[PDB]
Design an enzyme around this catalytic site. Sequence first.
Site, short mmCIF file in Angstrom:
data_model
loop_
_atom_site.label_atom_id
_atom_site.label_comp_id
_atom_site.label_asym_id
_atom_site.label_seq_id
_atom_site.Cartn_x
_atom_site.Cartn_y
_atom_site.Cartn_z
N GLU C 63 0.83 -1.19 0.00
CA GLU C 63 0.00 0.00 0.00
C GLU C 63 0.87 1.25 0.00
OE1 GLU C 63 -2.86 -0.17 3.12
OE2 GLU C 63 -4.18 1.33 2.21
N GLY C 136 -2.89 -9.14 5.44
CA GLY C 136 -2.22 -9.77 4.31
C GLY C 136 -0.82 -9.25 4.09
N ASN C 198 -2.70 -5.52 20.96
CA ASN C 198 -3.19 -4.15 21.05
C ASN C 198 -4.04 -3.96 22.29
OD1 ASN C 198 -1.86 -3.53 18.72
ND2 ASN C 198 -3.69 -3.27 17.46
N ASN C 220 2.86 2.42 19.27
CA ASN C 220 4.13 2.25 18.58
C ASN C 220 5.27 2.86 19.38
OD1 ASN C 220 2.31 1.30 16.74
ND2 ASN C 220 2.57 3.00 15.30
N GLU C 246 22.70 -14.12 22.31
CA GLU C 246 22.53 -14.66 23.65
C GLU C 246 21.07 -14.82 24.04
OE1 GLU C 246 24.73 -12.16 26.25
OE2 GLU C 246 26.68 -12.88 25.57
N1 GTP Z 1 0.22 -2.25 17.63
C1 GTP Z 1 -0.19 -1.70 16.49
N2 GTP Z 1 -0.91 -2.44 15.58
C2 GTP Z 1 -1.34 -1.88 14.43
C3 GTP Z 1 -1.04 -0.57 14.14
N3 GTP Z 1 -1.57 -0.27 12.93
C4 GTP Z 1 -2.19 -1.37 12.46
N4 GTP Z 1 -2.07 -2.38 13.37
C5 GTP Z 1 -2.58 -3.75 13.23
O1 GTP Z 1 -2.21 -4.19 11.94
C6 GTP Z 1 -3.22 -5.01 11.38
C7 GTP Z 1 -3.28 -4.82 9.87
O2 GTP Z 1 -2.04 -4.39 9.38
P1 GTP Z 1 -1.70 -4.49 7.81
O3 GTP Z 1 -1.88 -5.90 7.33
O4 GTP Z 1 -0.29 -4.03 7.55
O5 GTP Z 1 -2.71 -3.48 7.07
P2 GTP Z 1 -2.37 -2.97 5.58
O6 GTP Z 1 -1.12 -2.13 5.53
O7 GTP Z 1 -3.54 -2.22 5.00
O8 GTP Z 1 -2.15 -4.33 4.77
P3 GTP Z 1 -3.30 -5.44 4.68
O9 GTP Z 1 -4.29 -5.24 5.80
O10 GTP Z 1 -2.65 -6.79 4.81
O11 GTP Z 1 -4.02 -5.36 3.36
C8 GTP Z 1 -4.50 -4.60 12.07
O12 GTP Z 1 -5.20 -5.75 12.47
C9 GTP Z 1 -4.09 -3.82 13.30
O13 GTP Z 1 -4.48 -4.52 14.45
C10 GTP Z 1 -0.31 0.19 15.04
O14 GTP Z 1 -0.04 1.35 14.78
N5 GTP Z 1 0.12 -0.38 16.22
N1 GDP Z 2 33.33 -10.69 39.21
C1 GDP Z 2 32.76 -10.34 38.04
N2 GDP Z 2 31.92 -11.21 37.44
C2 GDP Z 2 31.33 -10.91 36.26
C3 GDP Z 2 31.61 -9.62 35.64
N3 GDP Z 2 30.91 -9.58 34.50
C4 GDP Z 2 30.23 -10.75 34.39
N4 GDP Z 2 30.48 -11.54 35.45
C5 GDP Z 2 29.93 -12.89 35.67
O1 GDP Z 2 30.46 -13.80 34.71
C6 GDP Z 2 29.48 -14.80 34.45
C7 GDP Z 2 29.63 -15.33 33.03
O2 GDP Z 2 29.68 -14.26 32.10
P1 GDP Z 2 30.81 -14.30 30.96
O3 GDP Z 2 31.55 -15.61 31.00
O4 GDP Z 2 31.76 -13.14 31.12
O5 GDP Z 2 30.02 -14.16 29.58
P2 GDP Z 2 30.85 -14.43 28.24
O6 GDP Z 2 32.11 -13.60 28.29
O7 GDP Z 2 30.03 -14.06 27.03
O8 GDP Z 2 31.23 -15.89 28.17
C8 GDP Z 2 28.13 -14.15 34.69
O9 GDP Z 2 27.34 -15.02 35.50
C9 GDP Z 2 28.43 -12.89 35.46
O10 GDP Z 2 27.76 -12.93 36.72
C10 GDP Z 2 32.54 -8.71 36.36
O11 GDP Z 2 32.82 -7.59 35.89
N5 GDP Z 2 33.06 -9.13 37.51
#
Ligand code: GTP
Ligand code: GDP
Lengths: 76, 420, 430, 431
Positions: C63, C136, C198, C220, C246
């Site tokens: 659209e 859609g 919603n 939004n 993660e």
């Molecule tokens: N949370 C949220 N939901 C929205 C918003 N605007 C639309 N929706 C939801 O989006 C659904 C429809 O979205 P769309 O499918 O993209 O509508 P469209 O762009 O005219 O495309 P078609 O409906 O598929 O033809 C509705 O059922 C609404 O519930 C919004 O601003 N916030």
């Molecule tokens: N003592 C200490 N522990 C930490 C710190 N940051 C993270 N941890 C601990 O390290 C644990 C494992 O995280 P980590 O191994 O560093 O994540 P990875 O590096 O992505 O593997 C977590 O449970 C944290 O509680 C820090 O600055 N000091």
Amino acid sequence: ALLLRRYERQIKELKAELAMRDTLSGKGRVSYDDLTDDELRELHATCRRFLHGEAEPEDLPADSMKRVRETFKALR
Amino acid sequence: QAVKVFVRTRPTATSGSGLKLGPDGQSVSVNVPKDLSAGPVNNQQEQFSFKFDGVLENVSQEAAYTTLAHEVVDSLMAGYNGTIFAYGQTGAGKTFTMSGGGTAYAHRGLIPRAIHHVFREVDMRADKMYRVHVSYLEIYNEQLYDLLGDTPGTSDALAVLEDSNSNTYVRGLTLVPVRSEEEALAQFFLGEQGRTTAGHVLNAESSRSHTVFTIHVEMRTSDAASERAVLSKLNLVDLAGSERTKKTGVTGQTLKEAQFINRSLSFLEQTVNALSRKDTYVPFRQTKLTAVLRDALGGNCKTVMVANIWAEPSHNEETLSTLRFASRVRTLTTDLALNESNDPALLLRRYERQIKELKAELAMRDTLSGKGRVSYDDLTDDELRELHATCRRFLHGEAEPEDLPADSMKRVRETFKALR
Amino acid sequence: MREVISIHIGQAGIQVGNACWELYCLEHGIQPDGQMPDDAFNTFFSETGAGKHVPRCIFLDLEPTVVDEVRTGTYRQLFHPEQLISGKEDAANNFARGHYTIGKEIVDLALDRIRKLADNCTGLQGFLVFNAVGGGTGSGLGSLLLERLSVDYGKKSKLGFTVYPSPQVSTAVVEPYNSVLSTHSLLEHTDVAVMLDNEAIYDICRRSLDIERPTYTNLNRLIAQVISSLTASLRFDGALNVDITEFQTNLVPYPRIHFMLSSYAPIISAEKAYHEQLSVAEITNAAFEPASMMVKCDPRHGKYMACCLMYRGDVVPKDVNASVATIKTKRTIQFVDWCPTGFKCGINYQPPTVVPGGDLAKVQRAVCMISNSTAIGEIFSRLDHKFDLMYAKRAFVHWYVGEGMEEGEFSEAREDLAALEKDFEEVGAE
Amino acid sequence: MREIVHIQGGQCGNQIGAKFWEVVSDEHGIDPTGTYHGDSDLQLERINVYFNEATGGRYVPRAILMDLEPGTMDSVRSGPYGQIFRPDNFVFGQTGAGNNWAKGHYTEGAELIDSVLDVVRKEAESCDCLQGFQVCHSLGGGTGSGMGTLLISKIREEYPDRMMLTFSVVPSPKVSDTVVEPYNATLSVHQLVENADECMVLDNEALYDICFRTLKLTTPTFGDLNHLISAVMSGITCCLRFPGQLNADLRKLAVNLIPFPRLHFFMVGFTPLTSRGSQQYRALTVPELTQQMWDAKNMMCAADPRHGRYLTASALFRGRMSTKEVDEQMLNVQNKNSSYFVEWIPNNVKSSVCDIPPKGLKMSATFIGNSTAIQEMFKRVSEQFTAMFRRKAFLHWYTGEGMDEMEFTEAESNMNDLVSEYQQYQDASAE
Ligand SMILES: Nc1nc2c(ncn2[C@@H]2O[C@H](COP(=O)(O)OP(=O)(O)OP(=O)(O)O)[C@@H](O)[C@H]2O)c(=O)[nH]1
Ligand SMILES: Nc1nc2c(ncn2[C@@H]2O[C@H](COP(=O)(O)OP(=O)(O)O)[C@@H](O)[C@H]2O)c(=O)[nH]1
Ligand SMILES: Nc1ncnc2c1ncn2[C@@H]1O[C@H](COP(=O)(O)OP(=O)(O)O)[C@@H](O)[C@H]1O
């Protein structure tokens, strides 16, 4: 898995039914589940040259295949 | 089920001053010479006596095998496990006993004679059907190096896994099936080539790795058809010598690996101590040696330790260390369980046979009870008994009534009086 | 360096993208013209040699009006003119129309644009696919785009922030149909799906912000705040950095179950602000209040399986640990027997900015709680009945079939959501 | 002349290592630009343990930082002491391991491990005599635990005889950070048991308890926990760097502490930890230091020693002190708490004294206790691991990285064997 469990349950039910039938029968013999004491077969084979015998209902695997064909015809 | 700690003495071709004695084949005594200079009439340690399950002063390899592992191999073919491992001094004949020089290499040593007897037993027991596998791995510097098959030499994926069905095995170990004696010999000699041996002062080619040759036996009954199968083991292990580490000296893979050998042996002795004390857990993970021998030395396995000693005027200290270790090993006694396969199809088939025979017998007895069972019938037709005797050579049945046809005509007249 | 590619599909996708990009421009200080007077913009903007920053986003719609509002709005020099993609005919709330007939050429062009955006990425944490399940354009075109992305890109983390139909209140009639169809479509392609209702966001706006007359702009804006809090660890350093890759490892126990409730806290206006202490424990309690959920799905019905907490602002690990300890000791909150930890705590040192003209206040602390729970099966229970109630006698089915489907596809989707139902029951039951 | 190669792994390990290097440079009087500014001969006497001299007066740490995401080492380089480290010793991948031990050990750590070992070998071969390596990292993390265990295995293969010291942050008991902490910890303990010669078990919740109860801090950030850990990592090796009345190096501590090879996990603590309010109110005496030492609250591991039995315990004291005082105090401690001490070891104390206390402190002492209390930490981690593994929660993430399901069972078996090992020596009787 499921087949093993179902077949084991069927075996247990069959054993229970056999025990219930033996209850009304003369006496409760062995369940004939297996022969852990395979030395009993050797003892029967040795006694085959004397007066003895033990067959019961299951025939004990046909007297242990007739004492293993009489110790393979006394070692031929 | 006991531990049969045997002792074997190296025949000193130089005929050194031998101090050991055997009065009755059970006890061995060593008299360390008291030092006259050091504290006259003030020493008080001269005699050391021990009792074992057997001593072999000077015997051939045939006699050594007959008195050492014949019963263990017989148990292996009877379904039990088995474990024969050697220990002692470096150059004391550990490898010599454990498949060494022997005489003429014509079924000499321990392992070649063992596999010869294994296949003789398989041939003779034509009733039951066997499946024999072998494996040969070396522990060097606390790393498992498989020898059979290809030799990666990197300890790749080789790890000792715990008892899946009450036996310790090795994951990634190349298990080689064997169907004749010649390929068994070939695999073993390939292992002999591949194992690591280094020069040494006590032994010209010292074994610097604990080698383990396991013969896996998979039983199956004469009828077979998935009944009472598999799960039998026999570990023939040749440990590495316990070096004093005062002659080697050189760190060039003679002392650095000697330290590892000593550590593995000390861990084994500590495990033996904990088993003799019968403490709860008796750790097995502290080294690859105890990990491999976890099922052995305990578990369900018939262990028979061999103590190769060397009687020399200066080897008395090492000999006494070996004897003390053997004496403390003798305290142990393990279990003997007839473990067999846990195959799912095996179980299913073996007790579907059970269910069919149970329902057949139930139907037969129900029909006899309901319709009517007639006893004392065909008492004049001795031709039926004659036919039963003739068919005893084949697979056939007999009449259930009248005491099972009078015990099948008294077992066909005791099989025609044992075939006359 | 840590770039995330943004896709906004359908009217709801583009309208939450407006709020998201306003929020990102405010956070990074980027003026709407395209340039600002280190490298924290890299997650969302790629800078040109002239100094103008172009966001790594794609506004996909069949659209023209929604895209043209952006093309004529204040953010006309910001986005790439070709990155704004418009179709010719709307999909008209027809999943089949947006998935089989109109969606083809548009998704081809979208894949080309996404490919050239990714060729501008040193690293690529993943995709942020923002659509509305129940239309859609959203359902059909979004499903097709996700299928193509899974086929070609492969293992990149796609986070689908889908808007599901509310339990009772709704704006479309064939909403259950295209909702079930798109749910079947994205059950196997998106890696972390976030449910939004919603109705729940309206209730949040009515009770916490005291907005008696909420609108799509407000909805939004809250959704954009949730996404910004989710991504805060990608741009600003802090204790306990949590990563896009993660999320799945610490939140998705089984690949089938990856639908997640989202909840933001605190949600207050300026007038009510600075009237409560807003401590870490209090805001965590508020985030785990059922009324703060952005999905009409009472967590008291089911059992929590994983809860990833994303704190922003002046939050200290001692305080977060005490708060989560109180949460665990609380009897009302129940986790499964097989997830004793069930918690992924993460903190960041950059508080969320306030968008001028919004109703959210300036608060030094914020919590974004994303939870994988078995209670979410309730929404699927509602839709699987609203679907088959129409389906047995096949209402509106001629429309969907007229754009290239069969009752085979409807039945397959229905049984697939039933499989999801008994899956939820399985992971719930011991 | 007995060098130590420091390695930092993962986010937690890198932060701990950065704080440790800040503390070490502070204690040696090194400013962040590398120039020595301590004005004391003893500080430069044994600086070669941790630092090398550049062309100028600059002193660069012998540290190697690993990560799979560059953000953590960007923060490290932006930190106050970020410029001392070798620009070549920052080794990073591109995409971080999503708290996945499998990713950090098999898929993503495999490519970076070659560069890591190249840098490690370059640092180690430069050393005249190498005491060993110290690796600071956290159990329960993807890149941290995975690359730490992989690197430890590689270094064990390369340098079997060299000392290996590990400072592992075991996941906390009560409040867990990541969900897959039990998986990562159980898989990492399996590698630490086999490879690491000496291991220090640290828990963030125990650190929070110590800093809130003894230090009485109000807002203890991760900087403070890393500072305490860094103080302990310095205190463990100050005998290498400074003259001591009875010195004891890392290998001596290992020999006197580890009775059996697998029982190399130690709970450690630092003294004197005094609150700001009662700093003037506390009296610095060796009896006071020992009394604070043997408190369970002082332990930086969650497990409290009262439940278990002290297999061994070493104390490295620092300051001008009476060896008679120290030995009498610890013998008195052993006699009074004999119930908590193993009977089949006549003396469960390894006492060492150094003559240079840390700056500002007249006296200090680091404690390293090997007790069976760590049984309960392993047991709790297993109580979580089995609960998750029965239903195979999150197991597909590890399985899709090319790690067998059997490896989880094998690691659990090893960990439970360690638990029962500790139990056997907890309730073993003499004779
Ligand atoms: N949370 C949220 N939901 C929205 C918003 N605007 C639309 N929706 C939801 O989006 C659904 C429809 O979205 P769309 O499918 O993209 O509508 P469209 O762009 O005219 O495309 P078609 O409906 O598929 O033809 C509705 O059922 C609404 O519930 C919004 O601003 N916030
Ligand atoms: N003592 C200490 N522990 C930490 C710190 N940051 C993270 N941890 C601990 O390290 C644990 C494992 O995280 P980590 O191994 O560093 O994540 P990875 O590096 O992505 O593997 C977590 O449970 C944290 O509680 C820090 O600055 N000091
Ligand atoms: N009958 C025998 N008993 C013991 N050893 C013998 C016998 N005959 C020869 N030997 C010698 O034993 C040596 C084998 O020692 P070996 O077992 O390899 O040492 P290690 O125990 O270090 O492996 C051979 O070199 C051989 O000379």
